[PDB]
Copies of this chain bind each other. A is one copy, B any other.
Amino acid sequence: SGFRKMAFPSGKVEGCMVQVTCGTTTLNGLWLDDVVYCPRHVICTSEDMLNPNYEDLLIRKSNHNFLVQAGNVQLRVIGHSMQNCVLKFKVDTANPKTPKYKFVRIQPGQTFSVLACYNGSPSGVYQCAMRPNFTIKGSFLNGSCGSVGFNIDYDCVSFCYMHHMELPTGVHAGTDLEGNFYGPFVDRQTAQAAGTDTTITVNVLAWLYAAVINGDRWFLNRFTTTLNDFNLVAMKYNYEPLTQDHVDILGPLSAQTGIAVLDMCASLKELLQNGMNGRTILGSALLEDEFTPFDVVRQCSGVTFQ
């Protein structure tokens, strides 16, 4: 038993991290088959990022201006192209560590693991969520750009995130592996508005179910509610609205615990209106929204990968 914020094992991703250098700028790239992917602002100086013309900056660059290093190995660059906000390098050698992989654009509220990297070398792994306003609250210092987020299904790595930007507010923004930003952000050093950040309601409910499975039950109440009644409360507390698709996803947890989804919504409603009275749930004094219903099921059945 017990419940932890768990990341996927990162071995398959470590073998794809490389260092990309262009002039004075070095950041992380992703080496799969014979292509290397990296944020396009590798071609920028600090002064360029205030207002970069990426097409005009890239035209000054040839294949040999890009230094791609995998461990101690130099890769030979034999072609380059810009796809949205990522650069793709055709190299001499296919990565022999290439796992089975897919590229995926995830939805707000989904979770993924982040392998934070500096100079092509892994530093740490953690789990996090795509917020409803398409930012993530990560841990990224200077040089972490090009670090990637992923999920794993058995033997297949689903890449869903490449880090590009810290916003002046301190939250983080990036792209999918086709180089399209999540959200309205651009790769430019300017003030950029993220939306109001709301709480991922279906995830909070999944974690309440996890709590009941682990013996933590003080918040279960004598009330029920309706979807429309709950959503009126949800809107007041900046919770995302709950839909029947969400109720359906929670089905298996409902069946295991014997607690109907609308009954657990009434417990959540009462927690939103009355607070937690200084009490804790699964060791947390706040309502946690970084576990998907799938995350909760995985942890409570012990699903592996290798």
A interface residues (Cβ-Cβ under 8 A, vs B): 1-12, 14-15, 71, 115-126, 128, 137-144, 166, 170-172, 214-215, 275, 278, 280, 283-286, 298-306
A5 contact set on B, CB distance < 8 A: 5, 126
A301 contact set on B, CB distance < 8 A: 141
For A144, the closest partner residue in chain B by CB is B302
Assembled-state Cα–Cα distance A14/B1 (Å): 22
Contact partner of A302 among B2, B141, B275, CB < 8 A? B141
Indicate if the CB atoms of A139 and B3 lie closer than 8 Å.
yes
For A116, the closest partner residue in chain B by CB is B6
27 residue pairs A–B, Cβ–Cβ below 8 Å:
A1-B141, A2-B138, A2-B139, A2-B172, A3-B139, A5-B5, A6-B116, A6-B123, A6-B124, A6-B125, A8-B125, A9-B10, A9-B124, A11-B12, A11-B122, A116-B302, A118-B304, A119-B304, A122-B306, A123-B304, A123-B305, A125-B125, A141-B302, A144-B302, A170-B214, A170-B215, A285-B286
Q: Closest 10 CB pairs between A and B?
A: A6-B124, A11-B11, A285-B285, A121-B304, A121-B306, A9-B122, A4-B139, A11-B14, A2-B139, A4-B126
Assembled-state Cα–Cα distance A259/B285 (Å): 28
Given A2-B170, A5-B5, A125-B125; 5 other pairs, CB 8 A cutoff: A4-B139, A5-B126, A9-B122, A122-B304, A141-B301
Assembled-state Cα–Cα distance A215/B140 (Å): 15
Assembled-state Cα–Cα distance A284/B71 (Å): 37
For A137, the closest partner residue in chain B by CB is B2
A170 contact set on B, CB distance < 8 A: 1-2, 214-215
Assembled-state Cα–Cα distance A218/B139 (Å): 21
Indicate if the CB atoms of A10 and B125 lie closer than 8 Å.
yes
A123 contact set on B, CB distance < 8 A: 6, 9, 298, 302-305
Given contacts A139-B299, A280-B286, A9 and B304 within 8 Å (CB-CB): no
A121 contact set on B, CB distance < 8 A: 304-306
Question: From residue A53, how far is it (CB to closest CB) to chain B in Å?
Answer: 28
Assembled-state Cα–Cα distance A138/B1 (Å): 8
Assembled-state Cα–Cα distance A142/B298 (Å): 14
